Design a protein around this ligand. Structure first.
Ligand SMILES: O=C(CCOc1ccccc1)NO
Lengths: 237, 300
């Protein structure tokens, strides 16, 4: 069944699972034509496939060439996502394949179920959570590798950096979703918070800055403030 | 014209024959139904006055034998049986006719309803869906489940309709996942028509038999089967033109015959709105769309 507030800790048990987010697969700029009509130009996208227990991010870059000569691209994008997730599962050793795949948007259920018919024991599940994975392209290093790609490419990142050496996966996931929620609500402010102090750097294999435990508590507090604010600034409260 | 005599009517019962029905009182001098048109399958069906639970009945073809009805007080139902002694049977029927103890199958001459509902239905295919090979006729009732229903529990008493499942490896060719799921023509024309049913007449026959079991016995599994077979056609971009024209006629007469007060449970909103308004064949069922819109515009 669906994943929600009530069964949240299931994400951090020892049954392998993946979240799949397709928001950033088909991305366009909308522009005017010389005739004054409107057209779209696709830009590179990505499938966001995340193990929430380990922080393993399998980032499949979707190059604009996959859309050439195709119709109904928003519909194709869901099937392309399912095709690539199925290919990823088949590429993993049996003992690494997920027991569940949780899709962040319900429209991915039928595409993924059909592509995974060979895997009747893998549960395909929706969620009622409003997870902020669309903001993945606000992470500079992820955006950079997507925009520079010249061909289809799978790039691997730990989305938690080294946090699991110090905190549990429940706490790491909560930090991740707080960071991503902030970046979704006000990217400029969020990014200012994360980089305001030039003495804290981002290691070359990492995505986020090397905060001490104490600085993370401060950072996390600043992100909550931002989110509550924007919620006022938005609703006037 | 053929006859199904009754030994007696010991319990009060509503008796149906095809789309007709009449009430028989407890111990009323009723000895059966005469003037049954030859050339069609028929169904004789029953609802006891004391237990509207379980509608039940028998599919039969008088060309296949001499059949009668006899109440069984142990099992508590009207049972169809075959009389092998042809001279005994003719003599029984002649006495009951002379005493005018039989109702007449009340077909209006203009009326093609039953033909139109059973055009492709054959007794030999019914007997493969309803397995009881020692009898020439086939029992169905409200509670019987389908083979597919059992997959998702007595197999001898099941309706062995052809399993249709749109999210199945039978329905979806590896590498054509999106193509085959959004346009089911492969599954309709190659898997089902060429492979399993052999021709569209056999497909339509099972579709018609499923509707009739849903209508006459409120058999839920049969209703599911009827809708699935409709949806498989409407969801196919490539359907022979003669099949679409015939489907429109088939469904027209099914919707025309459906009791107005049973539409809420026997018609699936999603299937009909998709079939008439979203599917590839949304523009190909003119008669069916007109009768549906004039008779059940709420459902849409
Ligand atoms: O370096 C590691 C282990 C391997 O990390 C990954 C990351 C993404 C996909 C698969 C494995 N932990 O930081």
């Amino acid at each position: 069944g669906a994943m929600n507030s009530s069964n949240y800790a299931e994400l951090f048990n020892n049954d392998i699972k993946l979240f799949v987010d397709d928001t950033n697969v088909y991305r366009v700029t909308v522009h005017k034509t010389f005739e004054g009509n409107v057209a779209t130009k696709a830009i590179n996208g990505c499938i966001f496939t995340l193990n929430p227990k380990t922080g393993h991010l399998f980032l499949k870059i979707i190059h604009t060439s996959v859309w050439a000569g195709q119709k109904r691209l928003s519909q194709l994008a869901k099937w392309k996502t399912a095709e690539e997730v199925s290919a990823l599962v088949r590429s993993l050793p049996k003992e690494e394949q997920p027991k569940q795949i949780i899709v962040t948007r319900k429209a991915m259920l039928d595409p993924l179920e059909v592509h995974m018919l060979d895997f009747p024991n893998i549960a395909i599940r929706p969620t009622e959570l409003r997870l902020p994975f669309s903001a993945a392209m606000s992470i500079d290093k992820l955006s950079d590798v997507v925009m520079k790609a010249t061909e289809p490419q799978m790039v691997l990142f730990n989305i938690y950096d080294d946090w699991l050496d110090r905190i549990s996966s429940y706490t790491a996931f909560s930090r991740l979703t707080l960071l991503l929620r902030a970046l979704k609500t006000n990217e400029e402010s969020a990014k200012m918070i994360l980089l305001s102090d030039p003495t804290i750097t981002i290691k070359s294999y990492h995505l986020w800055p090397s905060f001490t435990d104490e600085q993370w508590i401060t950072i996390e507090s600043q992100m909550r403030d931002l989110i509550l604010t924007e919620y006022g600034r938005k609703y006037n409260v | 014209m053929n006859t199904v005599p009754f030994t007696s009517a010991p319990i009060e019962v509503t008796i149906g024959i095809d789309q007709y029905s009449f009430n028989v009182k407890e111990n009323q001098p009723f000895h059966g139904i005469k003037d049954i048109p030859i050339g069609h399958v028929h169904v004789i069906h029953f609802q006891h006055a004391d237990n509207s639970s379980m509608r039940y009945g028998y599919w039969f073809d008088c060309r296949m034998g001499n059949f009668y009805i006899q109440y069984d007080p142990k099992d508590g139902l009207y049972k169809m049986m075959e009389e092998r002694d042809g001279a005994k049977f003719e003599n029984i029927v002649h006495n009951f006719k002379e005493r005018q103890m039989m109702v007449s199958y009340p077909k209006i001459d203009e009326d093609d309803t039953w033909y139109n509902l059973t055009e492709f239905v054959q007794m030999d295919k019914i007997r493969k869906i309803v397995r009881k090979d020692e009898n020439q006729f086939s029992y169905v009732d409200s509670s019987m489940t389908t083979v597919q229903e059992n997959e998702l529990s007595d197999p001898a008493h099941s309706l062995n309709y052809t399993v249709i499942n749109f999210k199945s490896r039978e329905a979806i060719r590896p590498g054509h996942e999106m193509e085959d799921f959004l346009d089911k023509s492969y599954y309709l024309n190659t898997v089902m028509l060429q492979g399993i049913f052999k021709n569209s007449s056999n497909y339509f026959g099972e579709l018609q038999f499923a509707f009739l079991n849903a209508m006459f016995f409120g058999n839920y599994g049969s209703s599911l089967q009827w809708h699935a077979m409709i949806e498989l056609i409407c969801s196919s971009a490539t359907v022979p033109k003669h099949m679409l024209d015939k489907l429109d006629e088939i469904l027209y007469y099914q919707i025309k015959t459906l009791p107005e007060q049973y539409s809420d449970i026997l018609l699936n909103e999603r299937v009909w709105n998709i079939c008439l308004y979203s599917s590839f064949q949304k523009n190909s069922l003119h008669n069916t769309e007109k009768i549906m819109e004039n008779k059940y515009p709420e459902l849409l």
